[PDB]
Design an enzyme around this catalytic site. Structure first.
Site, PDB file in Angstrom:
ATOM      1  N   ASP A   1      -4.943   5.791  -1.481  1.00 49.08           N
ATOM      2  CA  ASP A   1      -4.458   5.058  -0.268  1.00 49.08           C
ATOM      3  C   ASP A   1      -3.447   5.903   0.521  1.00 49.08           C
ATOM      4  OD1 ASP A   1      -5.713   2.432  -0.016  1.00 49.08           O
ATOM      5  OD2 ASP A   1      -4.391   1.710  -1.616  1.00 49.08           O
TER       6      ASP A   1
ATOM      7  N   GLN B   1      -5.969 -17.383  -3.518  1.00 47.92           N
ATOM      8  CA  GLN B   1      -5.954 -16.598  -4.782  1.00 47.92           C
ATOM      9  C   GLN B   1      -7.118 -17.041  -5.684  1.00 47.92           C
ATOM     10  OE1 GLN B   1      -3.987 -13.618  -5.781  1.00 47.92           O
ATOM     11  NE2 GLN B   1      -4.289 -13.797  -3.596  1.00 47.92           N
TER      12      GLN B   1
ATOM     13  N   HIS C   1       0.849  -1.237   0.000  1.00 49.58           N
ATOM     14  CA  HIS C   1       0.000   0.000   0.000  1.00 49.58           C
ATOM     15  C   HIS C   1       0.863   1.256   0.000  1.00 49.58           C
ATOM     16  CE1 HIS C   1      -3.308  -2.762   1.039  1.00 49.58           C
ATOM     17  NE2 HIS C   1      -3.939  -1.943   0.186  1.00 49.58           N
TER      18      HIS C   1
ATOM     19  N   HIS D   1       2.000   1.479  -5.619  1.00 52.26           N
ATOM     20  CA  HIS D   1       0.580   1.063  -5.778  1.00 52.26           C
ATOM     21  C   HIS D   1      -0.237   2.249  -6.275  1.00 52.26           C
ATOM     22  CE1 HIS D   1      -3.323  -0.624  -5.060  1.00 52.26           C
ATOM     23  NE2 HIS D   1      -3.575   0.317  -4.165  1.00 52.26           N
TER      24      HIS D   1
ATOM     25  N   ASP E   1      -7.901  -0.482  -8.636  1.00 52.74           N
ATOM     26  CA  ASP E   1      -7.330  -0.851  -7.333  1.00 52.74           C
ATOM     27  C   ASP E   1      -6.860  -2.289  -7.306  1.00 52.74           C
ATOM     28  OD1 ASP E   1      -6.444  -0.237  -4.924  1.00 52.74           O
ATOM     29  OD2 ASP E   1      -8.300  -0.828  -3.889  1.00 52.74           O
TER      30      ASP E   1
HETATM   31  C1  LIG Z   1      -6.418 -12.852  -1.166  1.00 53.63           C
HETATM   32  O1  LIG Z   1      -6.759 -11.503  -1.177  1.00 53.63           O
HETATM   33  C2  LIG Z   1      -6.268 -10.634  -2.138  1.00 53.63           C
HETATM   34  N1  LIG Z   1      -5.486 -11.162  -3.027  1.00 53.63           N
HETATM   35  C3  LIG Z   1      -5.004 -10.388  -4.031  1.00 53.63           C
HETATM   36  C4  LIG Z   1      -5.301  -9.030  -4.130  1.00 53.63           C
HETATM   37  C5  LIG Z   1      -4.701  -8.250  -5.265  1.00 53.63           C
HETATM   38  C6  LIG Z   1      -5.579  -7.196  -5.828  1.00 53.63           C
HETATM   39  C7  LIG Z   1      -4.428  -6.832  -4.948  1.00 53.63           C
HETATM   40  N2  LIG Z   1      -6.065  -8.446  -3.220  1.00 53.63           N
HETATM   41  C8  LIG Z   1      -6.565  -9.244  -2.234  1.00 53.63           C
HETATM   42  C9  LIG Z   1      -7.366  -8.540  -1.197  1.00 53.63           C
HETATM   43  O2  LIG Z   1      -7.520  -7.331  -1.252  1.00 53.63           O
HETATM   44  N3  LIG Z   1      -7.897  -9.278  -0.095  1.00 53.63           N
HETATM   45  C10 LIG Z   1      -8.598  -8.572   0.970  1.00 53.63           C
HETATM   46  C11 LIG Z   1     -10.032  -8.202   0.894  1.00 53.63           C
HETATM   47  C12 LIG Z   1     -11.031  -9.340   0.561  1.00 53.63           C
HETATM   48  N4  LIG Z   1     -10.724 -10.615   0.260  1.00 53.63           N
HETATM   49  C13 LIG Z   1     -11.938 -11.238  -0.036  1.00 53.63           C
HETATM   50  C14 LIG Z   1     -12.075 -12.647  -0.476  1.00 53.63           C
HETATM   51  C15 LIG Z   1     -10.963 -13.507  -0.473  1.00 53.63           C
HETATM   52  C16 LIG Z   1     -11.085 -14.812  -0.896  1.00 53.63           C
HETATM   53  C17 LIG Z   1     -12.353 -15.237  -1.342  1.00 53.63           C
HETATM   54  N5  LIG Z   1     -13.453 -14.360  -1.363  1.00 53.63           N
HETATM   55  C18 LIG Z   1     -13.324 -13.046  -0.965  1.00 53.63           C
HETATM   56  N6  LIG Z   1     -12.968 -10.361   0.079  1.00 53.63           N
HETATM   57  N7  LIG Z   1     -12.393  -9.193   0.485  1.00 53.63           N
HETATM   58 MG   LIG Z   2      -7.329   1.291  -0.009  1.00 51.15          MG
HETATM   59 ZN   LIG Z   3      -5.439   0.619  -3.115  1.00 51.06          ZN
END
Ligand SMILES: COc1ncc(C2CC2)nc1C(=O)NCCc1nc(-c2cccnc2)n[nH]1
Ligand SMILES: [Mg+2]
Ligand SMILES: [Zn+2]
EC number: 3.1.4.17
Length: 313
Positions: free
Chosen positions: A107, A269, A68, A72, A217
């Site tokens: 951010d 993932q 962050h 980013h 984002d």
């Molecule tokens: C594994 O989480 C992430 N991996 C890659 C990235 C990449 C884009 C930067 N970002 C997140 C992220 O922001 N996770 C936090 C928020 C969040 N995760 C979930 C979720 C997770 C799994 C299944 N259903 C929903 N909902 N809200």
């Molecule tokens: Mg943010």
């Molecule tokens: Zn962001």
């Protein structure tokens, strides 16, 4: 007014593509941003001196956290640049001005910790802002920096144009709270499918700009596999630090944030691509057909995580 930024040839060409990586040379990111503002908006949108002073005050207010961070900020602004350049005629002059700035600022002063962690820690920001805690902070920092002497990049707008652009930025930054994304996209899905989506309806535009903000984002999942895979390490380095801090407050973190469960990342993932990313870029592609490359790159990366799981890497 005759002073363009020009990039080297490979960057001049690749910066127009959605999957552009801004590279490891931090000192070039301001110039990349100004370049994108000049082509996206115009060489007249902003006084160069003011914009340069604004950019460097924004940079200074991003912290040295694994994900962050200032990189980013510029990455999310570049995805917005690509959406705007592929959708020339859909957006007002004020929206082009507001959205690149909103993305650069979205951010500001992030600490590497989720809204949840602030709430369990009982951080003062969670008392000041009960929902979208960090995002109200990011908007608050954006207004602070706009108010520094010499930093009002919008000074040449009328009183009402200024109120409109700060209102675009505020909604744009609040929309990056992923807790709000789920309902926003469901609503846009219903509106698109019953045929009621209307871009002259301000409240509809708002929702569409919100989804763009999510799309920009999340754009790490829309890079070529080697960029996506190496960025995942930065993302999880923050999450695991947050996990450690949850354990320090006497709370088992969720598995995503528990470094003792690194083995479950490929599956995590998948969930994330299937529950968040793919749906996001699908509804975006339905509303803004020329953003299909984001959906295609996202699907490519889902397939690469499937291969990681099948031990083919
Ligand atoms: C594994 O989480 C992430 N991996 C890659 C990235 C990449 C884009 C930067 N970002 C997140 C992220 O922001 N996770 C936090 C928020 C969040 N995760 C979930 C979720 C997770 C799994 C299944 N259903 C929903 N909902 N809200
Ligand atoms: Mg943010
Ligand atoms: Zn962001």
């Amino acid at each position: 007014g005759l002073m363009q930024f020009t990039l080297p040839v490979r960057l001049c060409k690749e910066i127009e593509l959605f999957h552009f990586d801004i590279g490891p040379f931090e000192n070039m990111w301001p110039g990349i941003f100004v370049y994108m503002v000049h082509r996206s908006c115009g060489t007249s949108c902003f006084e160069l001196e003011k914009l340069c002073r604004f950019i460097m005050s924004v940079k200074k207010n991003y912290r040295r956290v694994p994900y962050h961070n200032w990189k980013h900020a510029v990455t999310v602004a570049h995805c917005m640049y690509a959406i705007l350049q592929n959708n020339h005629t859909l957006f007002t002059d004020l929206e082009r001005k507001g959205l690149l700035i909103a993305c650069l600022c979205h951010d500001l002063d992030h600490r590497g910790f989720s809204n949840s962690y602030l709430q369990k820690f009982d951080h003062p920001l969670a008392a000041l802002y009960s929902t979208s805690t960090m995002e109200q902070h990011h908007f608050s920092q954006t207004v602070s920096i706009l108010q520094l002497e010499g930093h009002n990049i919008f000074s040449t707008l009328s009183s009402s144009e200024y109120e409109q652009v700060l209102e675009i930025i505020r909604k744009a930054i609040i929309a990056t709270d992923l807790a709000l994304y789920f309902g926003n996209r469901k609503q846009l899905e219903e509106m698109y499918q019953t045929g009621s989506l209307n871009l002259n309806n301000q409240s509809h535009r708002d929702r569409v700009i919100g989804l763009m903000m999510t799309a920009c984002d999340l754009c790490s999942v829309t890079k070529l596999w080697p960029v996506t895979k190496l960025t995942a390490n930065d993302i999880y380095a923050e999450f695991w630090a947050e996990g450690d801090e949850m354990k320090k407050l006497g709370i088992q973190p969720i598995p995503m944030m528990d470094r003792d469960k690194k083995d479950e990342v490929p599956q995590g993932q998948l969930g994330f691509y299937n529950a968040v990313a793919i749906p996001c870029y699908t509804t975006l592609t339905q509303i803004l057909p020329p953003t299909e490359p984001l959906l295609k790159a996202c699907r490519d990366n889902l397939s690469q995580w499937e291969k990681v799981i099948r031990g083919e890497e």
